[PDB]
């Protein structure tokens, strides 16, 4: 069977579609990325509970059928705003702003490393 099972997946090109309604009359209704809706009677090679309405799922190009659950997608613009090369500017580089640098490190950095402290006093971090 595995040889035949891979044969359908061996057609690597999938058609990304978003699950619209996981009807239980354990079926699924999908909306391929071509503005076409469908009523896959059998979910396919994926669990009937791992699929929640709105998830991204790949579909066989010719016989539409769910084969995998792709990871959630984010706009290309939003991914380019995550810094990977950390800037090199120590706190000693900033001058004069001593009463303000501390006030920030204790509201955006400290509450991120000493969660045991706020929960001990029961104050939601700012």
């Amino acid at each position: 069977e595995n040889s035949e099972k891979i044969k359908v997946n061996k057609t690597l090109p999938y058609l990304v579609s978003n699950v619209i309604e996981l009807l239980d009359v354990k079926c699924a209704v999908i909306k391929t990325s071509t503005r076409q809706t469908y009523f896959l009677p059998v979910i396919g090679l994926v669990d009937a509970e791992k699929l929640k309405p709105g998830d991204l799922v790949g579909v066989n190009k010719d016989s539409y059928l769910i084969l995998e659950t792709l990871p959630t997608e984010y706009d290309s613009r939003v991914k380019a705003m995550e810094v990977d090369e950390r800037p090199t500017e120590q706190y000693s580089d900033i001058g004069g702003l001593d009463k303000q640098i501390q006030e920030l490190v204790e509201a955006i950095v400290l509450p991120m490393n000493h969660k045991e402290k706020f929960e001990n006093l029961g104050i939601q971090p700012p």
Partner: protein, 73 residues
Amino acid sequence: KRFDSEKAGDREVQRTMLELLNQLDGFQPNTQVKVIAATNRVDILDPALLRSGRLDRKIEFPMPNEEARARIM
């Protein structure tokens, strides 16, 4: 700042702010994403964006007085 008017206006940008407002603190108590904002004109900001639930610790950054200019150099 939001702006009431007839005969044309600008609400396309206002929706983005309105989505920022609710995402920061609305119908969901997200407590792991910390928001830092930078601005050099606070008079123009919408009063809704300067609440306590939204950006909370409003720091004032003043010009160097007479010693910050020594360390700054």
